């Protein structure tokens, strides 16, 4: 029985797979052909079908788990293609699946079309916390799982640097997926969802597809990297002529996101790249402001950002870093994690002894 | 010297004008022709040029102010047309102007092209608080200035009803203009800006103009009233197949605003009206969530929404009413005000004895 953990989100399916590497001569000879066939397919390919990708760089090598040495693999595909994944799962050639995310419920009846399959569902928040605390405790092949941006307010000094979660309590976890959930973790047993926002990575991608015609998340990020968001955004200085110093708003801060788009003349001169950047900046800053308000409210100064909205997205990471640093006068730290999108999948996999 | 108060915003200029009605026979005969000419122009017209409007329905009749009986008029035009207002102010025919808003600073040098004019600038937040507490204390021609939506969670029962601010402390004031400023008013002397958000009425109008081609705020509201925002928004049930009951998210709540727009097929079947509604719903709910988080943080259960984003906008008012009521289990009251956009202009006018 292959060891999988699956987090089925609104947008992406995330899959963690533990490949045993201590396979004895007897076990290897007595391996079922279809089980041996899955292991070879998963480790001999980095693209699966037309939409599955294995994030080779995230692999945890020579991990001990359930008393076996093996490697932890990380795989992702769009939730839209889960039916293809399932139809191939029913391939005549071919087992316990721990699943979390909204789609463990939505697609429960579909998984049970695989006759030799028992589906155990696990709570999304439970799996996220367990997964995060586990990955950080085994480290990233000896490197820190958790990093931050030192001197996030100074550009010529800003650089990524490791961060130590040896005691990670208390902790605010901001999960930026399709939407946004915010968790307060006080201990490994005491955590709660304190709020969320529907203005998440789906909002960026949805709005940006509407405004610019971009076809992918990556194309949107690369358009955004070429844009100037101040072309679409009305700034404090467009209203004051300078700074609003009585309340500490500098002239370059955004007063109204997309506020310059109320003028036909400005809508006509704005580029898709500007709009892509304005969308990203607007979604990111609003998340950072909500996160800041929860942190102050929960009296928690470490805020960890996870989820896939930040994959290959350094612009948002820096925006979040700079924003928490600036508005909090340094008392709030934005924290990031190499395995950002996969913690639910890992936490699900860790629920395997419970069945 | 005419008595004006002017709040020059990022989008709209708001003007309060006190028309004296106790004009004695001597004063009337000895009135300067150009001062008599301004009074007749302002009270004999409801549209001024092509963009000025007098909100006749908001007039405060037979008010006593600075020891004179008169009427309080409320006028608005786009900040874009302030230069026209000023060039006509320099008309050879023709005096102290108290001004607030970012534009009192931005256009300070322009006002001084009017030779017989002394410009005194006043702080925006100061004027807002003074104006609000003053209008509510003189009432709306005997009716309550402040109202709310009783049973905001039940549709067949939801109705506007008066609300009493005889003691209005503490108070959270959420000013939804181009952007959003949030004030905590603990007393008439002790108030502070506690946060804000750049996702304000300019964001709704800017995004909606981009997405739908609407030419005006009113056209956007009327498009929104015909739309179905769930066509653009991904809901909890699109992800879970139903409710996320472990954390009390019903299946109809928005999981990801505009989240369904990541699918080419859905972008192709969505209508401008749907997009108009999704924009309004997304901006409004995010403001209501931020407001809820400040209220809980400031330990204040009365939240007053002002600014012009809500003029002729009952959909947003109800969304804000329902949202504060629902998420707070009834302990938070959304409050609204007949004179929503004009409190800064009134507060400025009240600074007149100080000069
Ligand atoms: N390859 C990708 N395909 C689609 N969306 C991506 C991709 N990479 C990053 N994203 C972003 O991640 C977000 C979803 O992150 P994720 O945490 O997996 O969400 P969910 O749990 O809702 O599926 C998307 O909204 C998008 O902004
Ligand atoms: N006639 C209108 N023209 C333009 N915007 C309007 C109008 N009526 C309502 N609005 C909305 O009010 C918002 C501005 O409100 P207001 O409080 O006057 O802002 P500001 O102080 O920044 O000028 C606009 O963003 C728009 O959403
Ligand atoms: C409902 C969700 C937990 C779904 O999880 P996801 O697929 O985004 O990982 C998340 O989208 C969310 O919390 N959205 C915010 C909804 C709200 O709090 O109003
Ligand atoms: C800067 C402003 C006070 C300008 O006032 P306005 O013209 O919107 O009435 C307001 O747009 C605002 O507070 N925006 C939010 C900016 C922020 O807090 O990040
Ligand atoms: Mg998720
Ligand atoms: Mg204003």
User: Where residue B88 sits, what CATH number does that domain have?
Assistant: 3.30.420.510
Spatial neighbors of A222 by CB under 8 A, at least 6 apart, are none
- Strand ranges (DSSP E) for A215-313? 234-235, 254-256, 302-306
**Does B237 share its domain with B182?**
no
Conformational region of residue B64, where left means phi above 0, alpha means psi within -120 to 50, and beta covers everything else:
beta
Instruction: Give A202→chain B minimum CA distance, Å.
Output: 4
**Does A84 share its domain with A6?**
yes
Among the listed residues A280, A277, A282, A292, the one whose alpha carbon sits nearest the alpha carbon of residue A174: A292
Do residues A237 and A243 make contact, with C-beta atoms less than 8 angstroms apart?
Answer: yes
Q: Write down which residue in B219, B243, B270 finishes a domain.
A: B270
**Does A39 share its domain with A101?**
yes
Q: Is A217 in the pocket of ligand 1 (CB under 6 A)?
A: yes
**Does B163 share its domain with B286?**
yes
- Strand ranges (DSSP E) for B177-331? 180-185, 191-197, 234-235, 254-256, 302-306
Q: Is B102 in the pocket of ligand 2 (CB under 6 A)?
A: no
Q: Write down which residue in A240, A270, A300 finishes a domain.
A: A270
**Does A207 share its domain with A262?**
no
**Does A163 share its domain with A263?**
no
Backbone angles phi, psi at A156, to 5 degrees: -70, -10
How large is the greatest C-alpha to C-alpha distance in chain B, in angstroms?
78
CATH number at residue B263: 6.10.10.60
Probe target for ligand 2 pocket from B175, B177, B313, with the most ligand atoms within 8 Å of CB: B177
Backbone angles phi, psi at B34, to 5 degrees: -70, -30
**Does B27 share its domain with B120?**
yes
Tokens of B297: 């943080």
Q: At what angle do helices B217-226 and B314-327 cross, to 10 degrees?
A: 60
Query: Sign of torsion, CA B39 B41 B47 B48?
Result: negative
**Does A190 share its domain with A206?**
yes
**Does B104 share its domain with B118?**
yes
Radius of gyration of chain A (CA): 22
CATH number at residue B189: 3.30.420.40
Domain count, chain B: 3
- Strand ranges (DSSP E) for B122-271? 146-150, 159-163, 171-176, 180-185, 191-197, 234-235, 254-256
**Does B350 share its domain with B258?**
no
Domain range for residue B251?
228-270
- Which resolution in angstroms does this entry have? 2.4
**Does A34 share its domain with A77?**
yes
CA angle A329, A332, A334 (to 5 degrees): 125
Whether A290 and B294 lie within 8 Å, measured CB to CB: no
Q: At what angle do helices A124-138 and A343-350 cross, to 10 degrees?
A: 90
**Does A204 share its domain with A260?**
no
Whether A125 and B247 lie within 8 Å, measured CB to CB: yes
Q: Write down which residue in B218, B242, B270 finishes a domain.
A: B270
Q: Is A16 in the pocket of ligand 3 (CB under 6 A)?
A: no
Nearest to A197 among B125, B232, B286 (CB): B286
Backbone angles phi, psi at A22, to 5 degrees: -100, 45
Instruction: Give B190→chain A minimum CA distance, Å.
Output: 15
């Amino acid at each position: 029985s292959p060891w999988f953990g699956m987090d089925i989100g609104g947008t992406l399916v995330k899959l963690s797979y533990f490949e045993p590497i201590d396979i004895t001569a007897e076990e290897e000879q007595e391996e079922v052909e279809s089980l041996k066939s899955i292991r070879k397919y998963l480790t001999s390919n980095v693209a699966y079908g037309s939409t599955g990708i294995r994030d080779v760089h995230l692999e945890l090598k020579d991990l001990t788990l359930f008393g076996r040495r093996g490697n932890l693999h990380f795989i992702r595909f769009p939730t839209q293609d889960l039916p293809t994944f399932i139809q191939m799962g029913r391939d005549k050639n071919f087992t316990v699946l721990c699943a979390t995310g909204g789609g463990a419920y939505k697609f429960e009846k579909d998984f049970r079309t695989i006759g030799n399959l028992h589906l155990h569902k696990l709570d999304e928040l439970d799996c996220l916390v367990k997964g995060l605390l586990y990955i950080d405790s085994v480290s990233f092949n000896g490197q820190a799982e958790c990093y931050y941006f030192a001197n996030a307010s100074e550009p010529e000094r800003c650089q990524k640097m490791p961060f130590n979660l040896d005691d990670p309590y208390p902790l605010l976890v901001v999960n930026i997926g399709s939407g946004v959930s915010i968790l307060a973790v006080h201990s490994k047993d005491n955590y709660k969802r304190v709020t969320g926002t529907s203005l998440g990575g789906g909002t960026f991608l949805g709005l940006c597809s509407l405004l610019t015609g971009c076809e992918s998340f990556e194309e949107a990020l690369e358009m955004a990297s070429k844009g100037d968001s101040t072309q679409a955004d009305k700034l404090v200085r467009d209203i004051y002529g300078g700074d609003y110093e009585r309340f500490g708003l500098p002239g370059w801060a955004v007063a109204s996101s997309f506020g310059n788009m109320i003028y036909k003349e400005k809508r006509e001169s704005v580029s898709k790249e500007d709009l892509a950047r304005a969308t990203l900046v607007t979604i990111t800053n609003n998340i950072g402001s909500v996160a800041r308000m929860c942190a102050v409210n929960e009296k928690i100064n470490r805020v960890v950002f996870v989820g896939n909205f930040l994959r290959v997205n350094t612009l948002s990471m820096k925006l979040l870093a700079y924003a928490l640093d600036y508005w909090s006068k340094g008392q709030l730290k934005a924290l990031f994690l190499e395995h950002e999108g996969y913690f639910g999948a890992v936490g699900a996999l860790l629920g395997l002894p419970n069945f």
